[PDB]
Structure 1
């Protein structure tokens, strides 16, 4: 619910190759990096089952190559929240026939992008399951 501070897909070199601040109210590319730094540096590819930072939900994940960040508020249950996060790995994996890689990332961004807008759009998750998508999309 207009609830994504950003969803970022971050490299684990603290880099971010995706960020959409769906919702935002703080700025700076730097501050974004800084903010990123404290937490990323700290989580350092390691993640947690759950993590709350800022009273805010941090659901983040890692892949086998990439670090997934979503920032949200601990003010909206894990199970769902994760479900979207889950949705993110999985569909990308199946559809593409391949999940995220650094390589994958490097060849083309777009698909992520395509997906992303569809799934979520700002601080409101319009959707969180693949299938609909799968049919819906045909690129």
Structure 2
């Protein structure tokens, strides 16, 4: 039981606006931020549903001032990961009552924290239905 390695929603530098680690491989801030900077550097300023970083398929999207991440295994493809990443974007948008930017996330830090935990649970994909997550969470 494992698909998603980690989820990060990063500003346009790779610094932690947010990350919640569905791996046990980053718990300390220094390394959680390093990871975040690492994934953001590869993936950014080339938007696609694919990136390969650290031998893992990284699926990412972007907004005005954020890049949104799911990191998962590379034995899969973008599309499986993408379903998590689409939930992540979508659910935060509907939850916060505003599209994902740094402003929406900061506006409601609580909605963001709770919403992401419903999407991924210890690296298993707990939820992937944006609607379900949003009802499930209370602001």
TM over 0.5: yes
Distance 1:138 1:27, change over 3 A: closer
Q: Which is worse superposed, 89-98 or 66-75?
A: 89-98
Distance 1:32 1:115 in 2: 20
Consecutive unaligned residues of structure 1, counting only runs of 5 or more, are: none
- Structure 1 stretches of at least 4 aligned residues deviating more than 4 Å after TM superposition: none
Distance 1:131 1:38 in 2: 31
C-alpha RMSD of the superposition: 2.3
Task: Answer yes or no: is the 8 Å Cα contact 1:50–1:59 preserved in 2.
Answer: yes
Consecutive unaligned residues of structure 2, counting only runs of 5 or more, are: none
Structure 1 position 115, deviation (Å)? 0.6
- The count of corresponding residues between Structure 1 and Structure 2 is 139
Task: Answer yes or no: is the 8 Å Cα contact 1:4–1:71 preserved in 2.
Answer: yes
Task: Answer yes or no: is the 8 Å Cα contact 1:95–1:134 preserved in 2.
Answer: yes
The structure with the largest alpha-carbon Rg is: 1
Distance 1:90 1:38, change over 3 A: closer
Structure 1 position 116, deviation (Å)? 1.1
Structure 1 position 27, deviation (Å)? 6.3
Task: Answer yes or no: is the 8 Å Cα contact 2:59–2:70 preserved in 1.
Answer: yes
